[PDB]
Amino acid sequence: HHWGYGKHNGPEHWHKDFPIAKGERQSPVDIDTHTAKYDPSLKPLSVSYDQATSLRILNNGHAFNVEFDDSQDKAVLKGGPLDGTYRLIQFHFHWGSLDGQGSEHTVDKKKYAAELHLVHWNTKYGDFGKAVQQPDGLAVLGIFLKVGSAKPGLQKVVDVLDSIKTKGKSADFTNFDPRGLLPESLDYWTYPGSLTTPPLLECVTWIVLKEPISVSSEQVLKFRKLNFNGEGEPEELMVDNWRPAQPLKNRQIKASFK
Ligand SMILES: [O-]
Ligand SMILES: [Zn+2]
């Protein structure tokens, strides 16, 4: 009886094994654009992904992760609200069973069809495992997806999903360039928060971009063909792998833009 996204093991259950689920700095949240404070002291983000090395894609039973080589400062995030250098380790998505839901973060209560998370860790801590135990250990870049025109730079990801349909399957996935997933503008909201899956540790500086990317109906359809289950087990489609919005409690969301 492991955690997941079903009726009997889904987000409203997670607190029984992970009491931090009801913590003071849980994610995701609803971003209220009229209550977010413009902070002109925030710098622009610095995304240097030109030397990124992707290695592998895998279905871990809750999403698919594309993993990068994080043994050196090859794909890093700096600037914005961050002090120091944060290395890219993986990206993944959250999506819905229908186009009107899927995202974790909401914007004035609007849900998007999916949400991309580019996960980075603070190099001062040495490794990812040590970083998740610190309040400033991780920086996650969140990007909304809406259904419209195709995103060319995502097609390489959608084409391999057939080969990692079930839990535990992996495939080599080299020379993928994550710059093809970024919107034009890098304006953002930022707030202190948490991982949105167990162990739900409160180690994340969230950077959520204002501008969504567009993907095609056919592209996100291909995400919905993946499976939560392992081979030979009963088929359960990997859909609605998102956590609902949590209480903002005593936090302020800041915007890099007015
Ligand atoms: O996440
Ligand atoms: Zn995520």
User: What is the count of DSSP helices, taking H or I runs of 4+ residues?
Assistant: 3
Kindly estimate the percentage of residues that lie in beta strands according to DSSP.
25-35%
Shape: globular
How many domains is the backbone divided into?
A: 1
What structural class do the secondary elements suggest?
A: mainly beta
Instruction: Could you tell me the CATH topology label.
Output: Carbonic Anhydrase II
Query: Regarding CATH, which class?
Result: Alpha Beta
Enumerate the distinct ligands.
Answer: hydroxide ion, zinc ion
The total strand number stands at 15
Order of helices and strands: EEEEEEEEEHEHEEEEHE
CATH H-level superfamily title? Alpha carbonic anhydrase
For the terminal residues, how far apart are their CA atoms?
46 Å
Largest sheet: 13 strands, mixed
Cα-atom Rg, whole angstroms?
Answer: 17 Å
How much helical structure, as a percent, in the residues?
under 10%
So, CATH architecture? Roll
Modified residues (Phosphoserine): 163, 170
Protein name: Carbonic anhydrase 2
InterPro entries: CA_dom (IPR001148), CA_dom_sf (IPR036398), Carbonic_anhydrase_a-class (IPR023561), Carbonic_anhydrase_a-class_CS (IPR018338)
Cofactor: Zn(2+); Co(2+)
What can you tell me about this protein's structure?
The structure is a monomer. The chain has one domain (1-258): Roll (Carbonic Anhydrase II), CATH 3.10.200. It contains three helices and 15 strands. Strands 2, 3, 4, 5, 6, 7, 9, 10, 11, 12, 13, 14 and 15 form a 13-stranded mixed β-sheet that branches. The chain has a two-stranded parallel ribbon with strand order 1-8. 37% of the residues are buried. By secondary structure, it is mainly β. The termini are far apart. Bound molecules: hydroxide ion (OH) and zinc ion. Residues 92, 94, 117, 196 line the site of zinc ion. The active site is at 62 (proton donor/acceptor).
